[PDB]
Paper text:
Tailed bacteriophages and herpesviruses translocate their genome into and out of their capsid (or ‘head') through a 12-fold symmetric portal protein assembly (or simply ‘portal'), located at a special pentameric vertex of an icosahedral or prolate-icosahedral head. The portal assembly serves at least three functions in the life cycle of most of the tailed phages: (i) it initiates head assembly; (ii) it provides a platform for the packaging motor during DNA packaging into the prohead; and (iii) it is required for tail attachment. However, the detailed structure of the portal protein, gene product 20 (gp20), remained unknown. In this paper we describe the cryo-EM structures of gp20 portal protein at 3.6 Å resolution and the empty prolate T4 head at 10 Å resolution.
Residue numbers in the entry:
A (entry chain B), B (entry chain A), C (entry chain C): 70 to 185, 205 to 516
Write the structure that this text describes.
Amino acid sequence: NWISELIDTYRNLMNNYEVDNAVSEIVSDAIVYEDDTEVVALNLDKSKFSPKIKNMMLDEFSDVLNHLSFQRKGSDHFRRWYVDSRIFFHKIIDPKRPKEGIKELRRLDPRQVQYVYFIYDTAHESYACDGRMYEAGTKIKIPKAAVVYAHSGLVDCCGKNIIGYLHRAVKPANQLKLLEDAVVIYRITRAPDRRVWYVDTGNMPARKAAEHMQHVMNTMKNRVVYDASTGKIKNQQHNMSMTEDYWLQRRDGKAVTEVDTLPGADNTGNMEDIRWFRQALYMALRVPLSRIPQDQQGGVMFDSGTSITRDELTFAKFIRELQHKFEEVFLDPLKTNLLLKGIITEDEWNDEINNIKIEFHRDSYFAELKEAEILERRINMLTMAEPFIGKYISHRTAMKDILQMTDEEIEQEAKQIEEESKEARFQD
Amino acid sequence: NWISELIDTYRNLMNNYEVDNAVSEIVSDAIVYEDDTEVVALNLDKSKFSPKIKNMMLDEFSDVLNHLSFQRKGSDHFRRWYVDSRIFFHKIIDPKRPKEGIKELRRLDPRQVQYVYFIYDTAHESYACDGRMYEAGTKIKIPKAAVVYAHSGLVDCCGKNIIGYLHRAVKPANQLKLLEDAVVIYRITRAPDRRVWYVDTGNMPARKAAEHMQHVMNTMKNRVVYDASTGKIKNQQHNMSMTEDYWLQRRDGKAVTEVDTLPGADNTGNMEDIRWFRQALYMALRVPLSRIPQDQQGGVMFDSGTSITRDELTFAKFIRELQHKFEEVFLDPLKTNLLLKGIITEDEWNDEINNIKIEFHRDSYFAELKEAEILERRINMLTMAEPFIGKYISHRTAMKDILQMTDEEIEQEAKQIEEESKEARFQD
Amino acid sequence: NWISELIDTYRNLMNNYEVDNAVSEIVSDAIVYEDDTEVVALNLDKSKFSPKIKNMMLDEFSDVLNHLSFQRKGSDHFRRWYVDSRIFFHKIIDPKRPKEGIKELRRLDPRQVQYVYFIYDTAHESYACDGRMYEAGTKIKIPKAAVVYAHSGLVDCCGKNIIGYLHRAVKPANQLKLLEDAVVIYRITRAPDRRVWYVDTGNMPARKAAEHMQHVMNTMKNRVVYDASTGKIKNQQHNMSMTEDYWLQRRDGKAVTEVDTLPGADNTGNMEDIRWFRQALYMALRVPLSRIPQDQQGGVMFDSGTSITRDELTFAKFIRELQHKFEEVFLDPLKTNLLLKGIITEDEWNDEINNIKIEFHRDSYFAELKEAEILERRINMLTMAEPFIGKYISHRTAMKDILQMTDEEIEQEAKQIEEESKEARFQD
């Protein structure tokens, strides 16, 4: 239940704006679709028994994505993992025969699952599984296999509870807005001039004294209105009074009946205040500040090509750490399906990972725009430390520590470059 | 009903300005008509049985656009999808014979449709379908086929409800204007000087005391007016009094009758306030801030050709994600018409998508102006790392990682470039 | 117990943001995963009996990481060491036979361990060890071997107690926030204009005097509201009153009934105050200030490649000192397993360390970007002091004190560079 109230407030963090902008900053590059290029490949770079089995996984893996319908439904499944604070896929298998094998993976609403042996609470009717039939309103129990349970790997203030990654920004977000209601509340109110009219009546009953109040309304009450639909001043057509005229009569021989205007909202503020808490909520999100929240006029800095800051570089790391947590949602539908189906056993799997890397695709554009500053500097070094490359540092030695190549890259290239010189078209 | 009240407030978000400017920012490039060039092509880049069937779709697809009348009615159907939060096209088929096949797709008003099996509520009389005749005022039921239902793929605060994409900006928009009425309300009011005239009368009945009030009006009341039609001061022709003169008589021997001017609207503000909430509503829209809301005098930054920022680059991604949601409105009138008509069955279709890409056309101008900075930098690298292209990195190796070409592009070109040299006109 | 309350407040330092940002600044580079490259290698650069035993450790050490599951669970085990202020791994061995040898290392919750002979307090049921069975709710005692106990090597104010490294920043952090509640508390309150209405009633019982108060509410009470869900003004549709009108009646012939508005929150501040304490908490963390907390517009400074400051250089030192404290968590599961298993005895081990260095991997990117300024300056010297290299300083002499090489590097290179000149491709 406490688990369930938590995934509420996270999802009412997304409801608000900016949090939505910054969270979908991440999911926009924590799994980035590109044209032609694929997302979430199964890099196999480890000792495997057959050249056929290592490629056989594609029959398994390029298909296990289909069940998630991952190609058009990925950046929601992940954006759910991250913001939900948990994500459960129920697994239908099989019912028979074994090694058929398996069936569609259906997402489960977090907040309807308890884990002490998974207790799926059912709101309304969701599914009939293999058998016997669709349960209704009852807590159905599913074993800790096979259900993929991927959690944001966070301990929390007191062990052991699951939290994040939005948590650290919940308190900050609740008090950035607690200013935006304050800043409009100050201005809305007092926007209209208010006036308190004190008129006195001594020694007359409230029954008939109020009659001396019914007369100062029906004679001097103001109907002037401003409507936000069309900005016109209703019941005042046409033109505007150059000036007003209110007429009060202090019945006694003393100055007690008067209008005292209540204060106008003088704008002393001076508002560097909210501008403080917005930079907070933004640091608390985990999104780099170099995304442009500020107007950032010009300046410019300046440079023709924006460089890799350490900010942005950090964040790629935060991401590629995420992807390695959401890595889970691929490896336990696969491994239980690659055991259900046959081939490799569990006792063989243990040694392979180790490394059976799942490569997410990065953004094609900033792979280049990063690898262009790396290579820009390595050539700038190399031109600079060039007249000495004959005299002090070998050619091989610079090529491998100024260019940061490796040996078999120089080997491969040295052989290759021979035919370039045979003969056209670069012979000058 | 709640669904229907929602699509109301979205459409009363468009009513306002800026929201209109920013929403039609999107639809201006989420489907961009250009001259000569076509919009919404059916890219077929997958294994298909016949060279004739893959081109046969044009008889199907270049015609399925006609039913939407998409060529002159596209940027409204989409601008409706996006802002409506839903979009339904009823499908007329057939009534007979099968594979005729089909008929015009008629848009349905959202807010008159309920989905639990589609319940089309009818306001007035809309259509007679194939049979039997035009229903009037009654909830007619249409099966979940065949009606194309395209929704903005959003879960909302509580599952499962449909929202967006305008939602996040609804609250912000309602309180940017709640300031613009405040800022005029402060100024309209008090624009005219108001004066409260206290004149006293002790120990005379209100019946005859009011007669001592009828005399201070008919002698000193001001008729001076300013009319907004023509800015002249009515009943004051010609010239303007150099100064005024009001005459009051404190009947008692004490200072109780007087004019107290009510405060003037002193402009202390100091208005960096609304300028806050307009930058909000604008971030909440999803339109990049680099569109020029600000005056942006000069500066300049400066550069002769405006570069691709990361802002703008992000947004192209947000768009091409939309287009892939509005992709739906093409593939289920087509697939149900490509099964109605014959040829490919449903069991064959499942493997094709996968990929049967629907290419929207981008803006011709900024394809270039982007592909000009990419290529500007790749040549700038290539000139810079040129003296080493003989010595360290092969020609092939640079051509494929400094220019980012591919092999069959170099293959194709190497063969091609031979005849350029045979012989004119570039031989110098 | 005091030990246990301490590890509470540290973990409620992490709960807060920024502390989380700065602590994971460290762990992001106190153990940095990289692709392909490994983390935590066992550098053996000392006299060892066999060429086989020195590599035999990998069977031992590349496996002792597996028990920690260090490859995907490292930057949590360390981030726990640092923030917890202690970290205990219980060691399961064996139960028989000896030299089997050993079993999984299970993390222990700090706050449930007392050391005077380790007293593991058990909350609920955690493990059954080899025998006899899982204890419940009782203080089980484990000998000071074998349990790895790694502490942040800090003495504290009074010897001998364990503290840090977060301690110095606890007081500062508790009073940066004691301002952020102050700064919103000032603004929240008074955000709404408050008015105190004094109305008088002399010589009437409180039983019936309150009836003269029930009437000024039900006639003049204001229901105008602003709701933060949707920013609209509830019960006020449509448009906004241009102005207000409140009507009070001083029953006596004297000015005693009136509205006195309570002060508005004038924003004199002038807030360079919190901006003070945030720079404190940030210096107290130990994270360099050159990470970009400030907006840091432009300027720029300027340079195309950001240099190694002395700040950043210091911090690498603070880190590599940490890693040498967390070095412990590798060497006592290894040495007790390399004695349990056999081979080297304790009397042999004493001489080896000395040096049996455990190399953490640094960040691949800033090894380069540091080693590029070092080498940039050594060449800049060398070009500058070049015409004299024939006349005054030898070639050997400059090569070894301008380039900072060593002899066997020049030896090795001089031999190598001969074949470069035999003959292609650099012969110009």
